[PDB]
Each structure stands twice: as structure tokens, then as C-alpha cells.
Amino acid sequence: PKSMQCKVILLDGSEYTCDVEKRSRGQVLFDKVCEHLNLLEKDYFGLTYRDAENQKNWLDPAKEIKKQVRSGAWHFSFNVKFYPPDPAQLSEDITRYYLCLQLRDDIVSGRLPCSFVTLALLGSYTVQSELGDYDPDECGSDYISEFRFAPNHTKELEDKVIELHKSHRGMTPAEAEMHFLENAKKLSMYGVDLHHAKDSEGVEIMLGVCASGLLIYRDRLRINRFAWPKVLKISYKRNNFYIKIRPGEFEQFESTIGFKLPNHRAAKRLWKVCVEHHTFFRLL
Ligand SMILES: CC[C@H](CO)NC(=O)Nc1ccc(Cl)cc1
């Protein structure tokens, strides 16, 4: 029975290797990675792979791995798929731990924009969790952490992390992770999956998918929001993505908003992540 080697980049940046039967569905690999991680609250997570065009795709746990990765390497990342609007409601500390690790990457990468003060506050909770109580013996007036806090590091940001770190004496890792998440969950781009698109007039926009609904970023002063409730139906055809917006009370007919995606695969990918978010956040 022939087995394919799988390599998974974990959220701590290390590599898990395992084997699965070559006709295995994605769930099989996902279950192995989750067991390795001691993760029971698996519903928020998934594996990604890079397609022939270098786009990130979610591995569908219901479909054969080989029919998704196709001609590519059996190389994956472990990621947060559904960012919980209220991490305090998660049943386990280890779930919140992996959620923190994902968010740290979202921040360092620039995917999750963040004010100077919030970068320093998030950094201080990471340091408290990882190193425990502030120690001057480690940190001098010229200290620079091994920890990556932001897309661009400044001495001012390193200093502010240390100042806030001093204030967290006695805080345990679970406590510091909860405080991290209480701050992170309020950021305007928390758990927003951005897709490049054009409106019906050809103007370049971003479509954001998240817990609350579908976001349209256009002029930066014109941000349209469609709560999952107001979204009646989602469709794709060729390079186009369509959402049907329910009529206001007393309106006879739904409105259709059409978008142009870069290609047919980008349209399909957007449609699938919308359906998945809509189902997930309709059961939450
Ligand atoms: C690559 C991940 C690094 C190194 O292991 N760990 C880390 O940053 N952990 C963490 C983050 C935030 C909080 Cl609050 C608590 C712990």
C-alpha cells in the first residue's frame, strides 16, 4: 500500500513529517497533524498548500490530497481557518496558544495591521508567556529581543515592549495568551481573508471574508459590509463572483453585486471560503 511523504510547516515555524496512503483524503493528514499538536478543538484550523500559480489554497479534508496538490509537492502549512470572534469562549488553553502563534505571523507578515502601541502590548504578552516575569539581568538599555513583533522593528518598539513587560509580573502563559487575544480580536483586520477583485465598473477593490460577513474595501472611506444574514446566495461563473443581497423589508427583489476576479480559480477559491465562513459562522 503506497504512501507519500507529507511535510507540514507548523505555527512555531518547525516541520512535521509523516506518511499517508497516496489516495488519502485531506482529513487523514489533518488528523495526524492535530494529534501531533495535542489539539482537540480542530474546527478552527486547516492545512494550506500552494497551487501551480503559487496561490494559497485550503486542503479540502473531504477530497483526495493528490487531486488538490496535483503536480505540486506534498508540502503544507498548518493555519487558523476560522478566527473565533471571542477566543475566551474556546474550551482549551492550547487552542488559544495556536491562535496566538497564527496571529503573531499575521502581525509580523503585515497581513494584520496594528498601531505602535498595540504592537508593543501584543509583544509584551508574548514575552511574558515565553520568558515569564521581566528580568533586568537579561535586558539592558540596548536590549533587542530575539522575538519578531512587527513587520518593521525600531528601538522605540523594543523599549515599549520592555516597559509593558515590566507591568505583567505574576502573569502565567495562559493569562498572557488570553490578554493577547482580547487585544488582537478588536483589530479591524482580525480574521479578515483579503481577495483582490474589480467591481462591475472595473475599479480595483478588496473583498474581505470573516466571521461577521463579506467586506468590500474600495476608497478607504467607502467600506461596504454584508452581514452573513443579508447575503442570500453566493455564486461564481468564469472569472466572476456574484453575491445576492436580500431586499430590505417591503422591497420586491434581491440585488446582485458582481465582481471580476483575476482568473476562474481565484473566483472559485473566493466562493468556497465564503460558503465555508457562511456555514461555520451560521452554526456559531
Ligand atoms: C514562532 C513562535 C514563537 C517561538 O516559539 N512563540 C511565541 O511567540 N509564542 C507565543 C506568542 C504569543 C503569546 Cl501571548 C504567547 C506565546
Q: By the 8 A CB rule, do 229 and 209 touch?
A: no
Q: Are residues 66 and 104 in the same domain?
A: no
Grid cell locating 51:
497551487
Give the helix/strand (H/E) hosting 8.
strand 3-9
Q: Among the atoms of ligand 1, which is closest to the Cα of residue 130?
A: 16
Domain boundary among the residues 189, 217, 245 is at 189
Pairing of β 231-237 and β 240-245 = antiparallel
Q: 99 C-alpha to center of ligand 1: Å?
A: 10
Q: What is the dihedral of CA 178, 87, 111, 45, to 10 degrees?
A: 120
Question: CA-CA distance, 241 to 56, in Å (whole number)?
Answer: 18
SS3 9: strand
Domain that holds residue 3: 1-81
Q: Are residues 70 and 122 in the same domain?
A: no
SS3 3: strand
Of the candidates 115, 119, 141, 143, which has an alpha carbon nearest to the alpha carbon of residue 131?
143
Residues with CB under 6 A from ligand 1: 12-13, 100-101, 104, 125-126, 129-130, 176-177, 180
Of the candidates 28, 25, 11, which has an alpha carbon nearest to the alpha carbon of residue 95?
11
Q: Are residues 66 and 40 in the same domain?
A: yes
Number of domains in the chain: 3
Residue type, 233: K
Q: Which residue's C-alpha cell is 452554526?
A: 283
Helix H, strand E, coil C: the string for 153-180 is: CCHHHHHHHHHHHHCCCCCCHHHHHHHH
Resolution of the solved structure (Å): 1.8
Domain boundary among the residues 153, 172, 189 is at 189
Q: Are residues 162 and 197 in the same domain?
A: no
First and final C-alpha spacing in the chain: 40
Question: CA-CA distance, 181 to 164, in Å (whole number)?
Answer: 16
Residue 20 dihedral angles phi and psi, to the nearest 5°: -135, 155
Which residue's C-alpha comes closest to atom 8 of ligand 1? 126
> Cβ–Cβ contacts within 10 Å for residue 110, how many?
11
Reported as half-sphere exposure (CB side, CA atoms, 13 A), residue 94 has a value of 10
Of the candidates 34, 43, 118, which has an alpha carbon nearest to the alpha carbon of residue 83?
43
